[PDB]
Amino acid sequence: KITPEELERIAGNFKNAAGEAQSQINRLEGDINSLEGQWAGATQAKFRGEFIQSKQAMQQYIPILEGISTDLKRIADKFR
């Protein structure tokens, strides 16, 4: 029923979704890093919100990403 071909295009979509996620964290990290130089004279108060939000987003998805990696690594190990 399931062919290598259909798995390829699913894997394709996976790689695309995984890359887009990597693309966005690179954008976010790019914005944070710009903040570092002007930070000392900035007014933190108006950045408190998005800082807490971004911190929450990242820390809550990290263990999800890691569980994805370990799940996938296990399947790719059966292939030995």
Added chain:
Amino acid sequence: KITPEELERIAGNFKNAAGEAQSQINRLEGDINSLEGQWAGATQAKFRGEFIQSKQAMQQYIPILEGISTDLKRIADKFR
């Protein structure tokens, strides 16, 4: 209180977790791809299992990854 220093460190762990996800996806897709050439007799039967797992896993992780990228996109938008 949260500093861009702190977020920068978290962001790096996020990058690493997302990277390991990409790492394993590429590993699995390489395995599937190497089978296209011999999608014949005992092979299909021998790898029917990992194929079922692979499809179930990939198909379910796609929208999760798409959820992550969408969330990060909107936050990065906010920083603007």
